Design an enzyme around this catalytic site. Structure first.
Site, short mmCIF file in Angstrom:
data_model
loop_
_atom_site.label_atom_id
_atom_site.label_comp_id
_atom_site.label_asym_id
_atom_site.label_seq_id
_atom_site.Cartn_x
_atom_site.Cartn_y
_atom_site.Cartn_z
N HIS A 47 -4.32 2.28 -7.42
CA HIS A 47 -3.45 2.15 -8.59
C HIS A 47 -4.35 1.34 -9.65
O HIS A 47 -4.21 1.88 -10.67
CB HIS A 47 -2.40 1.09 -8.17
CG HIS A 47 -1.42 0.73 -9.07
ND1 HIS A 47 -1.32 -0.53 -9.95
CD2 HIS A 47 -0.49 1.32 -9.65
CE1 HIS A 47 -0.40 -0.48 -10.65
NE2 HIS A 47 0.22 0.82 -10.50
N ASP A 89 2.14 4.41 -11.42
CA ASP A 89 3.31 3.30 -10.81
C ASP A 89 3.66 4.30 -9.76
O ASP A 89 3.98 3.62 -8.44
CB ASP A 89 4.17 2.84 -11.71
CG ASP A 89 3.41 1.74 -12.54
OD1 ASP A 89 2.19 1.50 -12.40
OD2 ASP A 89 4.15 1.07 -13.28
#
Length: 123
Positions: A47, A89
């Site tokens: 991420h 995300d």
């Protein structure tokens, strides 16, 4: 934005990102160094790598376009940079769900980021 991130995590996991994923391992949450400790922690590392690549928008602050279609999160809109955020995300939300079976709060919740001081892995 962070409001959105929380929504996607909840959707995929049934869990709140703020409660469950804001202080887990070496990478989940604020800060991150060393090597990820487990599969979940790795979702977070990836991420951070994913945001690091975003150029021309702010992955923490900007608002992206998304729809839920028969359980699936689809990343829309026309701005390529915002879609990139949506993609970061959603990929972390899916990665948390794949890894719920090895999630270990007893060992990793509130892990001391100090124990993360050994050769970082490249993105």
């Amino acid at each position: 934005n962070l409001f959105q991130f929380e929504k996607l995590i909840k959707k995929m996991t049934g869990k709140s990102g703020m409660l469950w994923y804001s202080a887990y391992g070496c990478y989940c949450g604020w800060g991150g160094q060393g090597r990820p400790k487990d599969a979940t922690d790795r979702c977070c590392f990836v991420h951070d790598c994913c945001y690091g690549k975003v150029t021309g928008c702010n992955p923490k602050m900007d608002i992206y376009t998304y729809s839920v279609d028969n359980g699936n999160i689809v990343c829309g809109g026309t701005n390529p940079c915002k879609k990139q955020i949506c993609e970061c995300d959603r990929a972390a939300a899916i990665c948390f769900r794949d890894n719920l079976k090895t999630y270990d709060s007893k060992t990793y919740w509130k892990y001391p980021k100090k124990n993360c001081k050994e050769e970082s892995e490249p993105c």
